[PDB]
Design a protein around this ligand. Structure first.
Ligand SMILES: [Ca+2]
Ligand SMILES: [Ca+2]
Ligand SMILES: [Ca+2]
Ligand SMILES: [Ca+2]
Ligand SMILES: [Ca+2]
Ligand SMILES: [Ca+2]
Ligand SMILES: [Ca+2]
Ligand SMILES: [Ca+2]
Ligand SMILES: [Ca+2]
Ligand SMILES: [Ca+2]
Ligand SMILES: [Ca+2]
Ligand SMILES: [Ca+2]
Ligand SMILES: [Ca+2]
Ligand SMILES: [Ca+2]
Ligand SMILES: [Ca+2]
Ligand SMILES: [Ca+2]
Ligand SMILES: [Ca+2]
Ligand SMILES: [Ca+2]
Lengths: 414, 414
């Protein structure tokens, strides 16, 4: 007694579903006398009491009725009169591919670090299709990109979902963004399609250690350099981004001799002096510099600071004599006093020229480069001149030249 | 004429350096008459005018005089009288191993990430030795540790510096700290030594992706569940530290049908309901959950939420008749009205028991599980009772049971 029909959805009003009169043993000779009607909470079908045909009266949208059910059937009752009887009529609504696939968003972003190995799989969002059956099964295609490809797997129910695969390593320092296009095409007639853009943001990874612009920082300064003066500036380049590019500079393998003399900026890398340079104490400094980032990648270089000799030391004079006593009967050339000179500076700043300032019966006789001898070159007499105030002046050959004066009293004994 | 001596440093006062009288052709017969003296800005040596010997007068510290020079010589002048002459005396001070090595700090810290490959080299700070020669060359020894070893290289000048090498991979999740002891021993007699402790801090690396406690979160709720009620709580474990352990929870591959129904906490991972559940619309929800950390490591699990059927729908009654008109001459059993019942709920909540509330000359005759027929079971007469107000009550078999009342007026025609 029950009867089932099968019509496609989205049929215009008046489309023939079937002949309920012919298909139930109802002769037309008593059709209007039985008043064939259709009772239903949702009025989707009507019956013409003239011929007994079951037609449609409203829009039959399968997605509004059943949704995503595999089978969409409608069960209503038909009422006849004289006598009153019920006729259960089932109507299976067939699904047509009238709805295209849709992604949740037109543009989707994905963050992938540079450390993604070749072959890494990244999950993608599947497209939804309001239809069922073959009109809902999707085929996913990715636009050709030399870095990314697409693999398509199936679930247990047969539904297909895309997954992004990496076929080329990602280098943010070469290309931080990748624009892909994913297209979902269902397997119905006609084949409806939709596209979406995938913005792949290459996340930074600490894979580039710091690199100094110079493997050796060699500079020459003077020892009279004041404290705090700028000596040089080391520079390191880190091609990464953010914390993986911030560089801190610091000294390594250093001692208190150099720690109390120089200062390295932890941010700008400027090398200054916190102490006093002295060419006589140390003429060359070799310091190791460390460049470290957030990823603990270290870079090492050496800095050599040369110091020039400045004429900041005056020649001192050392004298010696036989209790600074001279016999008035001494012969010409008798050693009266011994002179020793030395200058702490090097080069021509250390060479000394000793002079005899004044007019005395003596003369300077050079023996070595630093030892002089004061001999007699005139007559002596206690009752005439009892004492001589001999002044010795030694001047270096630097620029500006410095000198010192050493006066010794030489008594004349009888 | 110049003469050079060679004595070790740190000699007590009165130690014999040499016989300047014997070594310069000076007979003792005229030794005190020449008054042998030593002129020097830094008084380190003296000469006894009785025998002509050159002795020491103060502490001879080679580190205070020359520092770290390879050769430490002292050049002073000797003064003789009658006649006055100069005698240049050179004294080479030999270095003794009287100073032990020293590190810049007793405890040094080093940060090494877990990604350090087997064989990675890490620079160490060398020990300083105030002496020179073999008394300054250091031998570095590291305490045996199954993770670290020591390699020793030489510079161009022959000085030796230690470097730390990694022979076993570092896992912070297994051991975040490593306590090492580095010892520096110089090559002098006696061999002086010093130690230092190296605190190796294993820096964290995002190498542990999130892991869910359950690969499947299956729960069953009721459709009358209010909005905002706690459904379940997903949990992910990240064994890393800091940013590499903070986990965010979010839905993946979801649509507006489920997005408008549930809410996943991005921090606590608690799943709540922002919509109204309906067993008649959908009975099971399958949602994908993503667990992502700072290192972009993803973890995926599925959550299945089942819904129980609640008796929240009352059975509705559909009636039909021949214009609700009855002939008073109708035979017993004539179909007067047609009854159709259906309940949207499932199970026993959907099964319906139709009753005939009141006393009328009619009775309910069941045809199918949902269709009833009201037939005649008594006499009829228009002039006696012209109309009947038949009340139909249909009650479901749920808990609590719900029911509806449908009253139709049936006129008696003559
Ligand atoms: Ca449709
Ligand atoms: Ca459809
Ligand atoms: Ca479709
Ligand atoms: Ca890179
Ligand atoms: Ca990078
Ligand atoms: Ca870096
Ligand atoms: Ca100076
Ligand atoms: Ca100088
Ligand atoms: Ca000078
Ligand atoms: Ca010493
Ligand atoms: Ca020494
Ligand atoms: Ca030593
Ligand atoms: Ca680990
Ligand atoms: Ca870790
Ligand atoms: Ca992690
Ligand atoms: Ca409900
Ligand atoms: Ca229900
Ligand atoms: Ca019910």
């Amino acid at each position: 007694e029950p009867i089932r029909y099968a019509i496609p959805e989205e049929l215009d009003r008046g489309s023939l579903v079937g002949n309920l009169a012919k298909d139930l043993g109802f002769g037309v000779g008593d059709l209007p006398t039985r008043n064939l009607r259709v009772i239903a909470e949702k009025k989707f079908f009507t019956v013409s009491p003239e011929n007994g045909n079951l037609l449609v009266s409203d829009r039959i949208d399968r997605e509004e009725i059943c949704g995503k059910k595999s089978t969409c059937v409608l069960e209503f009752e038909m009422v006849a009169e004289k006598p009153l009887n019920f006729f259960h009529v089932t109507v299976l609504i067939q699904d047509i591919n009238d709805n295209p696939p849709t992604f949740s968003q037109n543009i989707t972003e994905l963050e992938i670090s540079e450390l993604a190995l070749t072959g890494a799989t990244f999950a993608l969002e599947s497209a939804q299709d309001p239809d069922v059956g073959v009109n809902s099964l999707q085929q996913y295609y990715l636009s050709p990109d030399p870095h990314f490809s697409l693999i398509q797997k199936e679930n247990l129910d047969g539904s297909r979902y895309p997954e992004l695969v990496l076929k080329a390593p990602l280098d943010r320092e070469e290309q931080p963004h990748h624009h892909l296009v994913l297209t979902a095409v269902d397997g119905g007639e006609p084949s409806r399609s939709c596209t979406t853009q995938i913005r792949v943001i290459v996340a930074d990874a600490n894979d580039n250690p710091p690199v100094f612009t110079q493997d050796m920082y060699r500079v020459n300064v003077a020892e009279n350099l004041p404290a705090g003066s700028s000596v040089l500036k080391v520079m390191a380049i880190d091609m990464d981004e953010g914390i993986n590019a911030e560089i801190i500079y610091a000294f390594i393998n250093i001692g208190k001799e150099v720690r109390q003399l120089f200062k390295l900026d932890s941010k700008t890398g400027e090398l200054t002096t916190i102490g006093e340079l002295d060419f006589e104490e140390r003429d060359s400094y070799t310091i190791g510099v460390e460049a470290k980032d957030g990823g603990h990648h270290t870079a090492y270089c050496k800095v050599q600071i040369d110091i020039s000799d400045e004429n900041d030391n005056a020649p001192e004079i050392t004298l010696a004599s036989e209790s600074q006593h001279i016999q008035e009967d001494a012969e010409l050339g008798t050693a009266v006093a011994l002179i020793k000179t030395h200058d702490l500076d090097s080069g021509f700043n250390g060479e000394i020229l000793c002079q005899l300032k004044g007019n005395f019966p003596f003369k300077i006789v050079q023996d070595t480069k630093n030892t002089y001898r004061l001999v007699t070159d005139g007559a002596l007499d206690r009752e005439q001149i009892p004492e001589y105030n001999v002044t010795i002046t030694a001047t270096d050959k630097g620029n500006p030249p410095l000198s010192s004066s050493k006066t010794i009293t030489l008594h004349i004994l009888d």
